[PDB]
Design brief:
Length: 537
């Protein structure tokens, strides 16, 4: 009999498995597929980097820290990955060239780490290998037919007639989660307000958008678009270009390409093949057309229905429904992996405690469920707001700076807790992250929640016909222009600054600006000396 059985041998399960095996527990990993296999969730974001570093230090699994840097990924995982220096956004209208004044770029600050485009095939193989090396058992090509809970544990039954017995079950697979299937955990219909379906593949021969747009030098981004994740924005949808070969001497010539479409505005086209639908959208936008002219798909296309789903419950006695087994929003802003990490960080230390006390009372896991649902609700709001804003660039502009400034602030929040735990050797400083009033919000501060609430009511009113996009953009731009907290040295409070470029000098200015700031949270999270900022470079 096992301590824990984990369903799903992707990153979510194998990171969790790696922790529990590293601490001496008997782990079984179950998955219906075999490695290597393709998987989605390619961009990594700053919060992902800092929370990977966090769980790596907190739980003593060095392999996890290797995903937190582009250079460590290339040196320890495989050479097959891309770099992610920035998020790039570009607006397109049907038949028209892209307007160079309707772009956004967020260059990721160096302090949070160097981000990457994960070739998930190789990261997930890496983590699976690490899990087995720590002691996990694994059954691949294993189809779960039945889950049974009693007061002594859980029994998982597979199609081949074998049986796995454990004290706890974690389902970390995905949409086809057998635990959600058994227990009817999926909410029908979903409570989620975001609607989007998908068509995606990997391609070879995709060009850089930098080489196919005619942009005046003064509107060209500080760093190349192709050096990060390109988001081609259009009405109620967006396209991603995620290269794995955007750096010198890259070995992987592939590029992840996909399109998200609001199915209420873009109903299904069963008369077309998935590829034909994809190209029908590409042909609407001539710059995208030029960028993808010689590109060829190397996989069987995936076309989905509405991809959003959510669950009514996440924990039970002797079980936990984790990350993508519980819910999904959109690939936009790459929240999923970050969410997975935050959950593992919160679940692991709890599960271990339960296991060594044979006390599986659901109350001890109540926070995990709260976190899960909060993660999903806030993520929903972030993406839905964005999709609404895609109709009108000046409204999107406010969405953009509100999201990205919080990226920086929350990243420094977690990083500060991490460094200070590394200096005092006291885990309290990491556990204080769980005392936030807004579980799931990336920036759990009152002024940010107010700003985000206001953004959300305006965007939902625009979606409902009660307010025009122009009016909401006017109101939000006023709020942004009269705000005092939006890292002005980086330009977040300037609506005419579209390319946020956090250079070293600006970060220094942020620290000085934060030192004598009236808000206590700004002072706590960003006030440094120039020495401290220069030291961590």
């Amino acid at each position: 009999p096992y301590d824990v059985v984990i369903i799903g041998s992707g990153l979510s399960g194998t990171m969790l498995g790696s922790i529990l095996a590293k601490h001496g527990f008997r782990i079984m990993l179950l998955d219906g597929a075999h490695h290597p296999r393709f998987a989605v969730g390619e961009s990594t974001i700053g919060q992902t980097l800092v929370v990977l570093r966090l769980i790596s230090d907190r739980y003593g699994v060095p392999e996890i820290a290797n995903l937190a840097s582009f250079q460590d990924v290339l040196a320890n995982v495989s050479s097959s990955h891309g770099q992610k220096s920035n998020f790039g956004f570009m607006f397109h209208r049907d038949g028209e060239e892209p307007d160079p004044n309707e772009t956004s770029q967020f260059r990721i600050p160096s302090i949070v780490g160097n981000a990457a485009h994960f070739f998930r095939q190789d990261t997930d193989s890496y983590m699976f290998h690490a899990a087995v090396r720590y002691g996990c058992d694994a059954r691949q090509y294993y189809r779960v037919e039945n889950i049974e809970f009693d007061d002594g544990g859980v029994t998982v039954s597979g199609a081949d007639g074998s049986t796995v017995r454990a004290r706890y079950l974690v389902d970390a697979s995905g949409f086809r989660s057998p635990l959600a299937r058994q227990l009817g955990l999926r909410e029908e219909p979903s409570r989620l307000k975001h609607h989007a379906r998908s068509i995606f593949t990997h391609m070879v021969g995709v060009d850089a958008i930098d080489d196919h747009v005619d942009t005046p030098a003064e509107l060209r981004p500080p760093v190349p678009w192709n050096d990060g994740t390109m988001h081609h924005i259009f009405e109620r949808g967006w396209m991603w270009i995620i290269p794995f070969n955007n750096h010198p001497g890259a070995t992987n010539p592939l590029c992840s390409v996909g399109i998200q479409l609001d199915e209420r505005r873009y109903p299904a086209r069963p008369d077309l093949t998935p590829e034909e639908e994809f190209w029908s959208h590409v042909d609407r936008f001539p710059a995208v057309q030029r960028q993808l002219k010689g590109a060829r798909s190397v996989r069987e296309w995936v076309r989905t229905d509405r991809m959003q789903y959510s669950s009514s419950r996440t924990v039970g006695e002797r079980w936990c429904l984790m990350s993508h087994a519980a819910g999904f929003i959109d690939p936009l802003f790459s929240r999923g992996l970050s969410n997975t990490c935050e959950i593992i960080n919160a679940l692991s230390w709890r599960l271990m405690a339960a296991l060594r006390e044979d006390d599986f009372a659901v109350e001890r896991f109540a926070y995990v469920e709260e976190l899960e649902q909060g993660l999903l609700d806030w993520n929903d709001k972030l993406v839905n707001n964005s999709f609404i804003s895609f109709s009108h660039y000046p409204l999107w502009n406010s969405v953009f700076r509100i999201w990205a400034s919080a990226s920086v602030i929350g990243g420094k929040r977690i990083l500060n807790a991490l460094t200070r735990t590394k200096e005092t050797g006291d885990d309290s400083h990491c556990q204080a992250l769980d005392d936030n009033p807004y579980p799931g919000l990336w920036c759990p501060l009152d002024f940010y929640k107010e700003a985000f609430d206001e953004l959300t009511e305006l965007c939902e009113a625009v979606d409902a016909g009660r307010t025009t996009a122009e009016e909401a953009a006017r109101v939000l731009e006023q709020r942004v222009r009269e705000s005092d907290w939006m890292l002005p040295a980086l330009g977040f409070n300037d609506p005419d600054t579209h390319h946020i470029n956090p250079t070293a000098d600006k970060m220094i200015r942020i620290a000085e600006w934060a030192t004598g700031h009236h808000r206590p949270e700004i002072r706590e999270l960003l006030a440094a000396s120039a020495e401290e900022v220069r030291a961590a470079m």
